[PDB]
Amino acid sequence: KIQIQRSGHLNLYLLLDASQSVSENDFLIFKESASLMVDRIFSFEINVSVAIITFASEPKVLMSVLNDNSRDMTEVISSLENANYKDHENGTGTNTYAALNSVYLMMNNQMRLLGMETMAWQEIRHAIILLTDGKSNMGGSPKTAVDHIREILNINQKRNDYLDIYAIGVGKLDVDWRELNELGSKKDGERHAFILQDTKALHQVFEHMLDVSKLTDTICGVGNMSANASDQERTPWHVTIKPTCRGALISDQWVLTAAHCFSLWRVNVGDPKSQWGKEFLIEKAVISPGFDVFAKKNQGILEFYGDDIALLKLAQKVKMSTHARPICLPCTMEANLALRRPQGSTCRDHENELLNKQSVPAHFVALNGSKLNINLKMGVEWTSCAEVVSQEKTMFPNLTDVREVVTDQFLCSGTQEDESPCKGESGGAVFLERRFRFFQVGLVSWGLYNPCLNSRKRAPRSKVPPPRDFHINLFRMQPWLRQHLGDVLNFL
Ligand SMILES: *[C@@H]1O[C@H](CO)[C@@H](O[C@@H]2O[C@H](CO)[C@@H](O)[C@H](O)[C@H]2NC(C)=O)[C@H](O[C@@H]2O[C@H](CO)[C@@H](O)[C@H](O)[C@H]2NC(C)=O)[C@H]1NC(C)=O
Numbered sequence: 496k497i498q499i500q501r502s503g504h505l506n507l508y509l510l511l512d513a514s515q516s517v518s519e520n521d522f523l524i525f526k527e528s529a530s531l532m533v534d535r536i537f538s539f540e541i542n543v544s545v546a547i548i549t550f551a552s553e554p555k556v557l558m559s560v561l562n563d564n565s566r567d568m569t570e571v572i573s574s575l576e577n578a579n580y581k582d583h584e585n586g587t588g589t590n591t592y593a594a595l596n597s598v599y600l601m602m603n604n605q606m607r608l609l610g611m612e613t614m615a616w617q618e619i620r621h622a623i624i625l626l627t628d629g630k631s632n633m634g635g636s637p638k639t640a641v642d643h644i645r646e647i648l649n650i651n652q653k654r655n656d657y658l659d660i661y662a663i664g665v666g667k668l669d670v671d672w673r674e675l676n677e678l679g680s681k682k683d684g685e686r687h688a689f690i691l692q693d694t695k696a697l698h699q700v701f702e703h704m705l706d707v708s709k710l711t712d713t714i715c716g717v718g719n720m721s722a723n724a725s726d727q728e729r730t731p732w733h734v735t736i737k738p739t740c741r742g743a744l745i746s747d748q749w750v751l752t753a754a755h756c757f758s759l760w761r762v763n764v765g766d767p768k769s770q771w772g773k774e775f776l777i778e779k780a781v782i783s784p785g786f787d788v789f790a791k792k793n794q795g796i797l798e799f800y801g802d803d804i805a806l807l808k809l810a811q812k813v814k815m816s817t818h819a820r821p822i823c824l825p826c827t828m829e830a831n832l833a834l835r836r837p838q839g840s841t842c843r844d845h846e847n848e849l850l851n852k853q854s855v856p857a858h859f860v861a862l863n864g865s866k867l868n869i870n871l872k873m874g875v876e877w878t879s880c881a882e883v884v885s886q887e888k889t890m891f892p893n894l895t896d897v898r899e900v901v902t903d904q905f906l907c908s909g910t911q912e913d914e915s916p917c918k919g920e921s922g923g924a925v926f927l928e929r930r931f932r933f934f935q936v937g938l939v940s941w942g943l944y945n946p947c948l949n950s951r952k953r954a955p956r957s958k959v960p961p962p963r964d965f966h967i968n969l970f971r972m973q974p975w976l977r978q979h980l981g982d983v984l985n986f987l
Pocket residue numbers: 793794795893894895
């Protein structure tokens with residue numbers, strides 16, 4: 496596997512077959528796949544260098560781990576996007592040996608400049624990925640280059656982890672499966688050779704080529720994008736609150752949730768040992784003191800969710816893992832770096848960054864742990880989304896203005912095909928995904944139809960009022976968030 500961890504350095508070598516057996520179209524699906532792996536590899540904030548080599552009769556180095564810019568993702572993506580298939584128009588053979596001996600020489604060059612004795616050289620782990628139909632036809636057996644590489648890297652039983660070779664045939668084209676399989680590493684328990692139909696199938700496979708198990712620092716908003724990973728792996732900030740409500744780990748001790756959900760309190764966090772999770776006690780609970788559901792009741796608004804926000808300090812720290820991680824909060828320095836945004840960004844800038852469109856795809860997690868889909872409505876579409884509460888005359892018998900219930904404190908979704916949260920889904924993250932990282936923009940507070948009242952009913956199209964969903968917007972809650980968390984999290 497390609498290991499995602501804080502110790503050491505990762506050199507990733509991306510080898511793109513531009514031989515005569517591949518069209519400029521095959522070649523573009525290689526570039527598209529390599530691009531994705533780069534963006535995914537740069538999502539974890541680890542020390543990584545990317546080499547980019549296209550190859551046919553001979554190898555062409557577009558980017559080298561010896562160059563500083565190989566640690567810079569913009570330089571990498573651009574070195575990659577300036578790859579022309581036609582640069583190999585004069586030697587269209589498939590010389591796999593020479594492509595790998597190209598990586599061998601880069602490694603020899605690097606060891607030379609660093610010194611084979613230094614930790615600079617020796618802590619580097621190396622992953623080669625060839626994107627090819629695998630039909631070598633010149634240059635000799637690539638095994639000669641793989642063995643030179645195993646030798647310079649002093650790969651022994653104790654150093655198996657320092658080298659992975661992948662051979663991946665991605666797209667329409669006819670693939671030699673024996674060449675691929677003979678290319679990739681031979682490690683017990685894992686595959687290094689794949690035949691995949693598009694870049695979407697690469698996305699999923701790439702998730703399982705990564706080993707993130709020893710990534711246990713507090714990095715926020717990191718998750719599993721595999722359809723085959725568990726629900727918790729996909730959303731590890733997600734916690735269960737038994738006062739049922741949901742919540743989100745925002746740190747290694749603190750959990751964000753809804754006030755309306757509230758010694759006997761339990762919080763179930765993710766745990767890699769069990770789908771069952773792990774139970775924690777609360778040490779301290781901070782409930783916004785503006786929250787009071789019946790505050791407008793005597794005046795005809797029978798439930799009011801203004802300031803529906805609460806924080807839980809767990810009684811012990813969570814150990815971070817594939818199953819327990821904070822989500823990123825906007826307006827923190829950590830969110831800033833995950834978004835790759837300029838350093839002096841403001842909270843207004845994060846809001847613009849994350850919620851710029853009039854309809855923003857977002858998610859909340861189901862009772863069963865499934866990730867469900869919503870579209871957050873912004874600007875003039877926020878008004879129309881929110882308007883429908885005038886249909887709801889039992890809860891809101893005396894509503895003069897929409898804003899007496901749906902204030903500026905709420906996000907709005909639940910229109911058209913959106914899912915709608917259920918009652919026990921309250922307090923959980925309303926989140927989104929951007930550059931493979933996860934940001935909490937709101938928390939489930941209330942709405943007009945409860946689908947669960949595993950199984951969700953869809954409202955009848957004739958039901959009044961229609962489903963509609965209102966989430967406490969975290970960009971509206973910064974004073975209170977800062978007041979309780981200024982020493983817990985690093986606010987812009
Ligand atoms: C129906 O809702 C409206 C809108 O909030 C209420 O009237 C508002 O009340 C506030 C004071 O609480 C006042 O400053 C506003 O001018 C007024 N808005 C408008 C546009 O009318 C109603 O509140 C009740 O009605 C009278 C008439 O305003 C108030 O004097 C009174 O405080 C209040 N009634 C009581 C004793 O609760 C509200 N109607 C009902 C039946 O609650």
